[PDB]
């Protein structure tokens, strides 16, 4: 596929070198038979030690040169293929990160990782295992072709004639084969997703004692994959049998012509024709196999060129931001489940230096408001304005530097406490991370850790208590000094004393604060209170 060759373009010098080495290997292999014939002839009668040593010497010399060239060729092709694999992985993963957040609910993470792991190998692995033997036999096959052409040109033309059903059978086989490969990859992805879900949430599984059920599910997926593999293998074997039968038909056609026809040479001409035909059929089969393998990986190419459902990027990066946020008749419905509105005609204004509290029952749409503020989703009606300009017109890094949120259930990453505080900062000094840890009251438990600020926080923060993880999320928010701060239930896991101590969110009076909570304790001190019920302001 021409797209994949364009992707392979940086590897061109290696392919050129490999082609040169292949040419040298063929040219060297042309000479070994000559001197081997002299060795055989001198051994078989008319013995002469002077010629014998010379013939053996040249045989050894050209075998040695051909061996070295072949080894270099093989190394070059292997390295080129591996580099192409790694480039495919890099570009696919880079493309996935760009996508809109709806994409990751339509797809599943285990399937995406299965794509990255598996589908790239199909498109990368163009070459069979035994290709070196196939190449080394080329000169012998050409020599056999020379014999049968001179012995009987007529029957050679009859051999060159293609079989009546050879073309259709190959097309049908390729069309079926590509579809079977695609189905196999889909089944593999589903099994990978099953394993991903089983392993990721294992503590719940063991709490309910449902390991055997997961094992049964995985075994069922494996059975489906096995059935697909068996179907592919059986179809390939049947195609090979049919191709051999067609070759046999062509064979006696010319056997008939040869018997019609120069005496005693039919015993030797048949062998050469059979060998040459087998070699050419194998070459055509390899070409078709490579074509089908590239064709089966179409979903990787699909993910590598999907344009996300996002507005064009934003130029704006002001030197100073006033931090006034305005909602103007905002209506929203999630892209995966439209026609079911969540927010209906919201309109409110947040001003710097004042604390706003948003309250409402479960499912009212408070986290939806928090997500619209951060430009994670686009409103389906109205506008969201920051400093009297649309939120989507600001630069990505600048916007998510000025506007910062603490999520409902904070997610941390495997790595140090220094890397979870100061996540996404290009550079952040020891002093700012300690000041942010002190501001969030996180520093008390950080000293008791074995390696302080350098201690490994486990995967998803699984090696911390809930309140500790919550405080590290608060410190991750505060280390940036945001102009607009959003707190989506930031004190749910904290004890009453730590919750009380953290109430003074904007004592300096220089930033906009939005507080989302259920408890009335954190909403009594707010300047403005907004009540949200069924997606409408009350």
Nearest residue to the partner Mg ion, using Cβ: 367
Q: What is the contact surface with Mg ion in residues (CB under 5 A)?
A: 367, 408, 466
Decide which of other proteins, ligand ATP, Mg ion, none touches 10; Cβ closer than 5 to 8 Å per partner kind. Answer: none
Nearer to Mg ion, 309 or 408 (CB): 408
The count of other CB atoms within 10 Å of the CB of residue 258 is: 19
Residue with tokens 């040593």: 53
Least CB distance from residue 334 to other proteins, whole Å? 8
CB 450, min distance to ligand ATP, A: 10
SS3 for 272-341 is HHHHHHHHHHHHHHHHHHHHHHHHHCHHHHHHHHCCCCCCCCCCECCCCCCCCEEEEEEEECCCCCCCCC
> Which is nearest to 384 in space by CA: 330, 303, 450?
330
Counting Cβ atoms within 10 Å, is residue 129 exposed (0-12), middle (13-18) or buried (19+)?
A: exposed
| Residue 175: CB minimum distance to other proteins, A | 21
In whole angstroms, the minimum distance from the beta carbon of 206 to Mg ion comes to: 18
> Does the annotation place 314 within a ligand binding site?
no
Nearer to ligand ATP, 105 or 175 (CB): 105
Buried b (16+ CB within 10 A) or exposed e, 261-297: eeeeebeebbebbebbeebebeeebeeeeeebbbbbb
> Which residue, 295 or 360, has its beta carbon nearer to Mg ion?
360
Find which of ligand ATP, Mg ion, other proteins, none residue 423 binds, CB within 5 to 8 Å per kind.
other proteins
Q: In whole angstroms, how close is the CB of 116 to ligand ATP at the nearest point? A: 24
Binding site annotation covers 125? Answer: no
82 touches which of other proteins, Mg ion, ligand ATP, none (CB within 5 to 8 A by kind)?
A: other proteins
Least distance from other proteins to the Cβ atom of residue 4, Å: 18
Distances (CA, A) of 136 to 16, 59, 111, 129, 186: 19, 16, 41, 14, 38
**342 binds, options ligand ATP, other proteins, Mg ion, none, Cβ within 5 to 8 A by partner type:** ligand ATP
Give the Cα separation of 290 and 282 in Å (integer): 12
Backbone angles phi, psi at 331, to 5 degrees: -125, 140
- Which CB atom, from 362 or from 507, has the smaller least distance to Mg ion? 362
By a kind-dependent CB cut-off of 5 to 8 A, residue 120 interacts, out of ligand ATP, Mg ion, other proteins, none, with: none
Q: Is 361 within any annotated ligand binding site? A: yes
363 carries a ligand binding annotation: yes
Q: Is 432 annotated as a binding residue?
A: no
Which residue, 3 or 536, is less far from Mg ion as judged by CB?
536
The residue ranges that bind ligand ATP (CB under 6 A) are 105, 334, 336-337, 342, 360, 362-368, 408, 463-468, 493
CB of 455 to ligand ATP, least distance (A): 10
Helix (H) and strand (E) counts for the chain? 22, 12
Output 123 or 343, the one with its CB closest to ligand ATP: 343
**How far apart are alpha carbons 7 and 10 in whole angstroms?**
8
- Alpha-carbon dihedral 136, 139, 141, 146, rounded to 10 degrees: 180
Specify whether the CB–CB gap between 324 and 386 falls below 8 A.
Answer: yes
Q: Is 366 annotated as a binding residue?
A: yes
Residue 108 binding target from ligand ATP, other proteins, Mg ion, none, CB below 5 to 8 Å by type? other proteins
Asked if 275 and 141 touch (Cβ cutoff 8 Å), the reply is yes
535 interface partner picked from ligand ATP, other proteins, Mg ion, none, CB below 5 to 8 A per type: none
C-alpha span between 305 and 122 (Å, rounded): 19
| Residue 492, binding choice from Mg ion, ligand ATP, other proteins, none, Cβ under 5 to 8 Å by partner class | other proteins
Query: Residue by residue, what is the 3-state secondary structure of 436-460?
Result: HHHHCCCHHHHHHCCCHHHCEECHH
Structure tokens at 372: 């619209």
Choice between 264 and 509, CB closer to other proteins: 264
The CA R_g of the chain, rounded to the nearest whole Å, is 36
> Which of the 8 DSSP states describes residue 393?
G
Residue in the structure block whose two tokens are 């020891």: 430
CA distance 191 to 195: 6
Residue with smaller CB distance to other proteins, 16 or 397: 397
Nearer of residues 86 and 310 to ligand ATP, judged by Cβ: 310
In angstroms, give the least distance from the CB of 497 to ligand ATP.
12
Nearest distance from C-beta of residue 367 to Mg ion, angstroms = 3
Give CB contacts under 8 A, 24+ apart, made by 204-212: none
Closer to other proteins by Cβ: residue 103 or 351: 103
95 binds, among Mg ion, other proteins, ligand ATP, none (CB under 5 to 8 A by kind): none
In whole angstroms, how close is the CB of 537 to ligand ATP at the nearest point? 13
> Which residues are annotated as part of the binding site?
360-367
> Which residues are annotated as part of the binding site for ATP?
360-367
């Amino acid at each position: 596929m021409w797209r994949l060759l364009k992707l392979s373009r940086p590897d061109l010098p290696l392919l050129v070198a490999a082609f040169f080495f292949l040419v040298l290997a063929v040219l060297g292999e042309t000479l070994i038979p000559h001197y081997s014939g002299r060795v055989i002839d001198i051994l078989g009668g008319d013995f002469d030690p002077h010629a014998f040593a010379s013939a053996i010497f040249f045989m050894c010399l050209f075998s040695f040169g051909s061996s070295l060239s072949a080894g270099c060729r093989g190394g070059c092709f292997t390295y080129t293929m591996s580099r192409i694999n790694l480039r495919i992985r890099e570009q696919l993963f880079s493309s996935l990160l760009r996508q809109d957040l709806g994409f990751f609910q339509e797809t599943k993470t285990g399937e995406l990782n299965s794509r990255l792991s598996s589908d790239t190998t199909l498109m990368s692995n163009w070459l069979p295992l035994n290709a070196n033997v196939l190449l080394r036999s080329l000169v012998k096959v050409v020599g056999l072709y020379g014999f049968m052409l001179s012995i009987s040109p007529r029957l050679t033309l009859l051999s060159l004639l293609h079989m009546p059903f050879t073309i259709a059978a190959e097309k049908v086989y390729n069309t079926r084969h590509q579809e079977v490969l695609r189905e196999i990859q889909d089944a593999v992805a589903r099994a990978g997703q099953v394993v991903r879900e089983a392993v990721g949430g294992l503590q719940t599984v063991r709490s309910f004692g449902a390991e055997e059920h997961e094992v049964c599910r995985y075994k069922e997926a494996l059975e489906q994959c096995r059935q697909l593999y068996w179907r592919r293998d059986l179809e390939r074997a049947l195609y090979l049998l049919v191709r051999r039968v067609l070759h046999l038909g062509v064979q006696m056609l010319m056997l008939s012509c040869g018997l019609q026809q120069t005496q005693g040479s039919l015993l030797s001409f048949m062998i050469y024709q059979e060998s040459v035909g087998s070699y050419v059929q194998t070459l055509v089969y390899i070409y078709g196999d490579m074509l089908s393998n590239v064709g089966a990986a179409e979903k990787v190419f699909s993910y590598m060129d999907r344009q996300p459902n996002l507005p064009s990027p934003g130029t704006l990066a002001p030197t100073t931001l006033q931090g006034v946020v305005k909602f103007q008749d905002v209506s929203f419905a999630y892209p995966n489940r439209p026609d079911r509105p969540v927010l209906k005609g919201l309109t409110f204004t947040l001003r710097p230096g004042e604390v706003t509290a948003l309250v409402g029952p479960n499912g009212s749409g408070k986290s939806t408001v928090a997500a619209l503020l951060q430009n994670l989703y686009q409103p389906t009606g109205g506008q969201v304005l920051l400093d009297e300009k649309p939120i989507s017109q600001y630069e990505h890094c600048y916007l998510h530097s000025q506007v910062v949120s603490v999520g409902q259930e904070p997610v941390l990453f495997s790595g140090s406490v220094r890397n979870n505080i100061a996540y996404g900062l290009q550079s952040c000094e020891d002093d700012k991370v300690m000041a942010a840890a002190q501001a969030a009251h996180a520093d008390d438990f950080i000293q008791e850790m074995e390696h302080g600020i350098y201690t490994d926080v486990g995967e998803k923060g699984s090696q911390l208590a809930a309140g500790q993880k919550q405080r590290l999320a608060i410190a991750r928010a505060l280390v940036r000094d945001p102009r607009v701060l959003i707190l989506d239930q930031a004190t749910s896991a904290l004890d009453v004393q730590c919750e009380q101590a953290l109430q003074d969110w904007n004592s300096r009076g220089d930033r906009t604060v939005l507080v989302i909570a259920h408890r009335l304790q954190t909403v009594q001190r707010a300047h403005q209170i907004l009540v949200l019920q069924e997606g409408k302001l009350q």
